[PDB]
Design a protein around this ligand. Structure first.
Ligand code: ACA
Ligand code: ACA
Lengths: 384, 384
């Protein structure tokens, strides 16, 4: 039992509707207006082939930038300096207003929602996860504080070998609908989370996507809103975005908070703009000045033992669902597999969005190239 | 074997990607930009409770109209007289720009695409289905002409008892992803179609959703385009619609042509406007004047033996995926279960869109009420 969860619609029974009941009353009134949430669906374009390159100014400083973007399988690239879009690139076949999967950049958005609730006093990061999700008692999340989830400083037995279907990484995906269910798999994401275990130690960084989903679960218990709605109410609806964002949902309607959000490059930049504006967005304050300051300040360096990160960023750290480089520019970034970045360059008051599709989720090679681009573009924005 | 089908993306292998391979190259470049086509997804609103009733003029003639709409579980209602929206209604919780499942009104859209191709000389309705889809040899579609599919005049052993999972109606849904697959079910919609059989007789009307999917299959074989794209290229992209429409897709990416399209009420009205404009839309001619004329003229009355239709419309018929009332007003309508109608009233040059969610897919009761409303509103538009 995973306890109470936000109903898919007002008055809906637990877990309703399912793929086999959405056509029945009372579910159908809701389902007929949100079928994409139940069945895979394609867009039928209202509009009746070549890459779009508008690298503007930085072009002179970075002559081979377009080629570098192509080399890193770039789908969408956008640089926002202050409130102005100063550079843009979209591969052939990807429109400027098309949406792109964010993978783990989604985590930084979730952390933002949590931050909003902390500001409201609805969530106390010092409290144990079980204070908000009692059903996580008996799991690896029994004992750790919400802040430890936010900073991913919980030791968890989590097999990351996606080649092995028995791995936690693969099981997590199947439990959420990202892959075909296998006999024995948990019914939904909530159930999957309760199956996680660890030695009980905390304090050391361990990147684990399950942590973000636990944060989303906490968000639901504290607000009573489906994570999908909370993500809109506390963040998306305040950005004055061009388009809605989307998020994959599991069989209960629970959004895949750790990596299932998709949005346009320009809209993602609005999240970065909000961060560089002390937590304020066009529709109102999203998070407190303090929350933003803590994100830019970074997490405990000693907790960060991931060489994949520290080899490039020796003084790097992680906090509140954001990667902190700890470099001379104080760069902080949301990061997602296959080349997704919501990169903040406070020095130039700029945001760099890079959405890609590397053939591999992660390799030292791709990261070296990707970071080289983000750093070069950041430096190209410096006053000279 | 169901033969060649349009690749999900340029160069894609047959059936790729699947729910278990979309994250892999080369599929991921496409998948990351169209994840909703693979995994159920929810919209994260960019916008931060009460019914909207703007029945304008017809209000005076139909004082209790709003109540009548509520009684028939109306979600969206819109009347377009000429090029002007003269009446609108949206239930509480449904925004004017929200999309709604069209159910079988989707069939009329498919027939329109077929008509466009007939006008181009790419499809000859007199030709046997097997001329375009040879793989349907050995099935109930081996022998009948494309026109017989268009007019649904093929006898098919098709169990319509949805309560029975073994029924063709239920199996059709599961094969397309509208329901959870059961061991033994066809892998996709194409395969399901090839399993259909009949006594070989033709000429009498038999409403069967499988017919529309065969039409979509023909569309794909003749154009080489995924039905999703053909629906946009030959119809949607020429309407100057406010929003994209959406269509559910099965595991191969094949759109559920018979009933999976969703769109706004106002945009659906643009389809009716095109029909009343002799087949021309803002973006160009969609179908020929002759095609539209044949739709308004109706099909063979003798073929129409469905009492559920003739008890209300004695001189009714069906042709090219449209229901023809044969009444004194010459009303013709796209119809879908649970109360969906794309109703044409040529006399007043008006289109009536009614999207609903009746608790039941079909009952004499709901239809009596629904038709009473459509007829009363049509008459209220008459010059006096
Ligand atoms: N859990 C499935 C993949 C989620 C994305 C993870 C990441 O981008 O680091
Ligand atoms: N084949 C699943 C239902 C399709 C809708 C049918 C109809 O509206 O008549």
């Amino acid at each position: 039992s995973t306890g109470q969860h936000p109903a898919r619609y007002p008055g809906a029974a637990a877990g309703e509707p399912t793929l086999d009941s959405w056509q029945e009353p009372p579910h159908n009134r809701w389902a007929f207006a949100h079928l994409g949430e139940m069945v895979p669906s394609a867009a039928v374009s209202r509009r009746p082939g070549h890459a779009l390159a508008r690298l503007g100014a930085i072009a002179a400083q970075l002559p081979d930038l377009e080629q570098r973007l192509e080399q890193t399988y770039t789908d969408a690239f956008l640089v926002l300096r202050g409130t102005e879009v100063v550079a843009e690139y979209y591969r052939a076949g990807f429109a400027p207003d098309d949406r792109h999967l964010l993978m783990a950049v989604s985590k930084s958005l979730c952390g933002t929602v949590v931050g909003a609730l902390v500001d409201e006093g609805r969530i106390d990061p010092a409290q144990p996860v079980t204070e908000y999700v009692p059903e996580l008692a008996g799991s690896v999340y029994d004992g750790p504080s919400v802040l430890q989830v936010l900073d991913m400083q919980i030791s968890i037995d989590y097999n990351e070998d996606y080649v092995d279907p028995a791995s936690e990484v693969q099981t997590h995906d199947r439990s959420a609908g990202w892959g075909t269910r296998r006999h024995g798999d948990p019914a939904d994401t909530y159930e999957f989370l309760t199956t996680l275990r660890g030695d009980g130690s905390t304090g050391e960084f361990q990147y684990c996507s399950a942590n973000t989903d636990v944060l989303a679960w906490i968000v639901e218990r504290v607000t009573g809103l489906r994570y999908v709605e909370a993500l809109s109410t506390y963040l998306w609806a305040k950005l004055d975005a061009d388009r809605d964002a989307t998020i994959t949902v599991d069989t209960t309607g629970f959004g895949f908070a750790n990596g299932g959000v998709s949005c346009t490059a320009r809209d993602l930049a609005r999240v970065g703009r909000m961060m560089l504006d002390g937590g304020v967005a066009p529709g109102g304050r999203v998070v407190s000045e303090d929350w933003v300051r803590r994100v830019l300040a970074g997490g405990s360096h000693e907790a960060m033992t991931d060489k994949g990160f520290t080899n490039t960023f020796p003084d790097g750290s992680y906090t509140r669902q954001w990667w902190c480089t700890g470099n001379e520019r104080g760069n902080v970034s949301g990061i997602g597999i296959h080349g997704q970045n919501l990169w903040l360059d406070p020095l130039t008051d700029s945001v760099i969005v890079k959405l890609s599709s590397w053939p591999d989720p992660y390799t030292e090679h791709w990261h070296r190239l990707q970071n080289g681009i983000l750093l070069d573009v950041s430096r190209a924005l410096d006053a000279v």
